[PDB]
């Protein structure tokens, strides 16, 4: 009985076995049926800290190599799996943070069976997702921004994706994605689908030597214009509200956005500093948290203040275009 069978049988895995299971998955040695079975089994009983850590290690080792010489290196990313179906603002917040001087390496992917993933949005904005890791790394060093497409850095994710899409439920990959930034990001604004994961993911980041905030927004895996719950690595837990940082509250519905084409249009207007509603406020909130997490500003309020200025300046769109041109070289 190999480690995969043990996992399917629902038995807790020793660190070495957890590592082996993910190594096999990343190596393309596991059939779709057994991959589906092991993911469901792990999701039912709940993956333990040592298991997640071991699987994360297997993923980092299987990743296409990339070394970025800029630090702090910020990632604004979420676990996904919240079901709220809100627009993915992390990508826009990440661009604002980069336009403000923070080195950014945002980790993202395509959305299951919607064109809404961060990778989908960026592609619609002109980003060539096929660009090699070395070119993306050069962009981060020279321009301060880079988008790390999951499938490119972790090839196996191309096969894991359909399995996750079909199962249609949360799996260990929802937790592993944020924890496996392939550029070695050390600063985070990491959103989670449930408050239960705020502390665990913050502790995971701390063990990795990373810093930042783990966030949850009234059900969504991103900061929203409401009573957000946060856990700052090394410090503790606290609430983060819009009024706290000079922003107004808005229902979650105001952050839903629309179809892929509409969101692509919204993105341009937002980055250009033309769109001014709740969507702009939410991007400013996340970017502000990013400036704080990356040490660009000493506080969240100063971070949000800077983010509002940067967003309104339209510099984030100018940066996006520099990025697009850089990759098309």
Helix or strand holding residue 57 (H, E): helix 49-62
Based on the shown chain and the rule CB under 5 A, indicate whether residue 72 belongs to the binding site for Na ion: no
Contact call for residue 169 and its own copies (CB under 8 A) = yes
Residue closest to Na ion when measured from CB atoms:
273
Min dist CB 226 to its own copies, Å, is 26
When asked if residue 212 is in the footprint of Na ion (CB under 5 A), the reply is no
> How many other β-carbons are positioned within 10 Å of the β-carbon of residue 268?
15
Beta carbons of 250 and 103 less than 8 angstroms apart: no
Angle separating helix axes 315-327 and 90-99, nearest 10 degrees? 100
Q: Residue 16 interacts with its own copies (CB under 8 A)?
A: no
Q: What share of the chain is helix, strand, coil (3-state, %, to 5)?
A: 50, 10, 35
Looking at 16, 61, 261, 274, which residue binds its own copies (CB under 8 A)? 61
Residue 65's binding partner among Na ion, its own copies, none (Cβ under 5 to 8 angstroms by kind) is: its own copies
Judged by CB under 5 A, the chain residues 291 through 310 that form the site for Na ion are 295
In sequence order, the β-bridge partners of residue 216 are 229
- Greatest Cα pair distance, the chain, in angstroms, is 60
> In a 10 Å sphere around its CB, with 0-12 CB exposed, 13-18 middle and 19+ buried, how is residue 12 labelled?
middle
Q: Does 99 bind its own copies (CB under 8 A)?
A: no
Q: Segment near Na ion (CB under 5 A), from 64-72, 115-123, 175-183, 273-281?
A: 273-281
Query: Taking CB under 8 A as the criterion, which residues in 131-160 touch its own copies?
Result: 155-156, 158-159
Instruction: Name, in order, each residue with C-beta under 8 angstroms of 106's C-beta and a sequence gap of 6 or more.
Output: 74, 75, 76, 77, 90, 91, 94, 118, 145, 146, 147, 148
Least CB distance to its own copies at residue 32 (A): 4
Nearer to Na ion, 260 or 295 (CB): 295
* Residue 46 contacts its own copies per CB under 8 A: no
Binding site for its own copies (CB under 8 A): 2, 5, 8-10, 23-24, 26-41, 43-45, 61-65, 155-156, 158-159, 161-163, 165-169
From the annotation, which residues make up the binding site for anthranilate? 78, 109, 164
């Amino acid at each position: 009985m190999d480690a995969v069978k043990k996992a399917i049988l629902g038995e807790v895995l020793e660190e070495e076995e957890a590592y082996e299971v993910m190594r096999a998955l990343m190596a393309g040695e596991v059939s779709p049926v057994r991959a589906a079975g092991l993911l469901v089994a792990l999701s039912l009983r709940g993956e333990r800290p040592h298991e997640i850590a071991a699987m994360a290690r297997a993923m980092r080792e299987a990743a296409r190599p990339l070394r970025v010489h800029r630090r702090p290196l910020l990632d604004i990313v979420g676990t996904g799996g919240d079901g709220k179906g809100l627009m993915n603002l992390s990508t826009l917040a990440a661009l604002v943070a980069a336009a403000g001087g923070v080195a950014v390496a945002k980790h993202g992917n395509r959305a299951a069976s919607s064109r809404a993933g961060s990778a989908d949005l960026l592609e619609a904005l002109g980003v060539d997702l096929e660009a090699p890791p070395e070119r993306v790394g050069e962009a981060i060093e020279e321009l301060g921004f880079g988008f790390l497409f999951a499938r490119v850095f972790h090839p196996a994710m191309r096969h894991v994706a359909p399995v996750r899409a079909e199962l249609g439920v949360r799996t260990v990959f929802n937790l592993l994605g944020p924890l496996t930034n392939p550029a070695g990001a050390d600063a985070y604004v990491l959103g989670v689908f449930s408050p239960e994961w705020l502390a665990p993911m913050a502790e995971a980041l701390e063990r990795l030597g990373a810093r930042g905030l783990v966030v949850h927004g009234e059900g969504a895996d991103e900061l929203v214009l409401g009573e957000n719950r946060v856990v700052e690595v090394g410090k503790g837990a606290y609430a983060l509200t819009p009024e706290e940082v000079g922003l107004k509250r808005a229902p979650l519905e105001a952050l839903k956005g629309g179809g892929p084409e509409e969101n692509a249009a919204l993105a341009r207007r937002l980055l250009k500093g033309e769109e001014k509603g709740p969507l702009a406020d939410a991007v400013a909130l996340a970017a502000g948290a990013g400036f704080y997490a990356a040490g660009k500003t000493p506080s969240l309020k100063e971070g949000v203040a800077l983010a509002r200025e940067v967003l309104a300046s339209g510099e984030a769109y100018l940066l996006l275009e520099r990025y697009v041109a850089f990759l098309r070289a």
